[PDB]
Structure 1
Amino acid sequence: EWQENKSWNAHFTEHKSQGVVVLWNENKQQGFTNNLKRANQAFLPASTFKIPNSLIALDLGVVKDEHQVFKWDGQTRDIATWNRDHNLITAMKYSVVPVYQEFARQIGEARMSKMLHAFDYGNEDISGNVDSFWLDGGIRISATEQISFLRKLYHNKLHVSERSQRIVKQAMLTEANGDYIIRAKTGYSTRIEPKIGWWVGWVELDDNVWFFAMNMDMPTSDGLGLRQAITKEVLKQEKIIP
């Protein structure tokens, strides 16, 4: 059911890094990773938490739809793309933390905790500040746990409406061409050691879906592009994409 291929470590060590890639073949119900241990180590989700946060905000009516505009609060931040109005689509595309921080305040501790428990999401622990726990609080999730959660979302099996799940999968759209569709979300965790980058999602093919979750050491922001680049290299090596 699970195969470990330690030779895949070269994808990371060739960049003087370390990490884990986890792949799941939905048709064959088989998993693959370079490192079974790190596949099951729990890290802060950071901006990958925008997936469950979006679902909860939609299902409770905090967010009406993917067109609702969340106005910039006029506070100049160091990420230029954050100093503008957003909707759900652009907020997920540019990982706009302050928009999702307001979602979390409106959701509130009680409803956030119950919903993460309903999702079986990570360690389901929101200890910390309700507007920052996915960045520096107690919540943790592993790469294998990300895949379990994503599989439920793909199949509309989470305990929110079908509509909420369809909208979030639309907002996850990252790449599409004649060969495949990728729906995914990046993450970048710097407030608690070890600093890591994430990329989680799946690849839609004509007759199969491959789920993936990866994290890697990220001592500086200079390496953030390696999250997608390495993952796609693995997908190409394994003949999942051309």
Structure 2
Amino acid sequence: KHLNVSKMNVDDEFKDTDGTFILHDLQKDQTFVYNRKRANQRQTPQSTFKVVNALIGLQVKAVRDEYDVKRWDGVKREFESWNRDHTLGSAMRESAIWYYQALARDIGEERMKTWLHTLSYGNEDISGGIDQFWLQSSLTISPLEQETFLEKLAKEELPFDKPVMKIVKRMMIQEEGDHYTLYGKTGTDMGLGWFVGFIKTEHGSYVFVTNVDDSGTKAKNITVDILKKYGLITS
């Protein structure tokens, strides 16, 4: 009764949404892809880039750990959850862009470019500016390239320190149930939505990448519906 990802079908979940979905079974080494053409199209990563930003920032000690506090300046920004003191981990959870812009400025161009080159991270183009390049700007990456990177993060086959990789994966936890742990990060801009991450169950471990012509919230809802359908999200 164990999941064979090659027999999946997600047509129903995408009935009224243009998008792509990738699920990689880490232990069997098997992948399901819906809409391979779209999976190959590069797009701006938006806030899915926080995963990379956090890895590089911890690696070069621009931030100390998931609890490194940056005080809010008191400026009311677009979402109330941004208008508070944040840590590296809480700013990932709430997608507080201002925190990760300060982090990118501290990382700086040279270290950002060098470490981004180790990840095969799409076109690796940061010319849009040190604190702007992942936000509807120069950097683009395809869903397949996101999957390849996240698979290497899951396997810790990246040149980062191992504790750095474990901290960033922990910061991505969205739900810890009795029988599964869901990891993920959303991105959204101009009718393109991402939800990328991992799910660990009692019987397997998986990487997923979802990208849609809709919000990141929609991308996440589609992903959760698929993972529920195939019994990976239960309780």
TM-score (norm 1): 0.89
| Alignment correspondent of 2:176 | 176
Q: Which residue of 2 aligns with 1:12?
A: 14
Structure 1 residue aligned with 2:222:
230
**Does structure 1 retain, via aligned residues, the 8 Å contact 2:194–2:216?**
no
Shift of 1:208: 1.6
Residues 193, 217 of structure 2: 8 Å contact kept:
no
For the pair 1:86 / 2:80, whether they are aligned, the reply is no
- Partners of 1:37 and 1:78 in 2: how far apart? 34
Contact in 2 for aligned 1:4/1:35 (Cα 8 Å): no
> CA–CA distance in 2 between the matches of 1:10 and 1:47?
27
- Three-state SS of the structure 1 residue aligned to 2:175 is strand
> Deviation digits for residues 21-68 of structure 1, max 9, x if unmatched?
111111221111221111111111000000000011101111011122
In structure 1, stretches of 5+ residues that fail to align are none
Contact 1:9–1:18 (Cα < 8 Å) also in 2: no
Tell me which residue corresponds to 2:64: 64
Q: CA-to-partner distance for each residue in 1:97-148, whole Å, 9 max, x for gaps? A: 0110111111111111110101222222212111110012221111111111
* Whole-angstrom distance in 1 between the partners of 2:97 and 2:189: 12
Aligned alpha-carbon RMSD (Å): 1.8
Distance in 1 separating the partners of 2:143 and 2:163: 26
Rounded to whole Å, the distance in 2 between the matches of 1:201 and 1:224 is 13
Cα distance between partner residues in 2 of 1:30 and 1:180: 20
Partner in structure 1 of residue 232 of structure 2: 240
Structure 2 letter corresponding to 1:239: G
Count of residues in Structure 1 that have an aligned counterpart in Structure 2: 230
Q: Which residue of the partner structure matches residue 205 of structure 1?
A: 201
Counterpart residue number, 1:129: 129
Cα deviation, 1:74-102, whole Å, max 9, x if unaligned, reads: 22112111111001121000000011011
Aligned to 1:145: 145
Amino acid at match of 1:203: I
User: What does 1:5-84 align with in structure 2 at a 5 Å threshold?
Assistant: 8-13=10-15, 16-84=16-84
Aligned to 1:225, what secondary structure does the other structure show?
Answer: helix
Superposed displacement of residue 207, structure 1 = 3.4
Whether the 8 Å CA contact 1:4–1:33 is kept in 2: the answer is no
2:210–2:223: 8 Å Cα contact kept in structure 1?
yes
Q: Could you give the per-residue CA deviations for residues 196-217 of structure 1, whole angstroms, max 9, x where no partner exists?
A: 1100001101232111000111
Write the distance in 2 (CA, Å) between the matches of 1:81 and 1:235. 28
88-97 vs 114-123, greater mean Cα deviation = 114-123
**Closer, same or farther in 2 for the Cα pair 1:4/1:204, shift >3 Å?**
closer
Task: Report the Cα distance in structure 1 between the residues aligned to 2:82 and 2:89, rounded to whole angstroms.
Answer: 13
TM-score, L = length of structure 2: 0.92
SS of match in other structure, 1:32: strand
The one-letter code sitting in structure 2 at the alignment partner of 1:215 is N
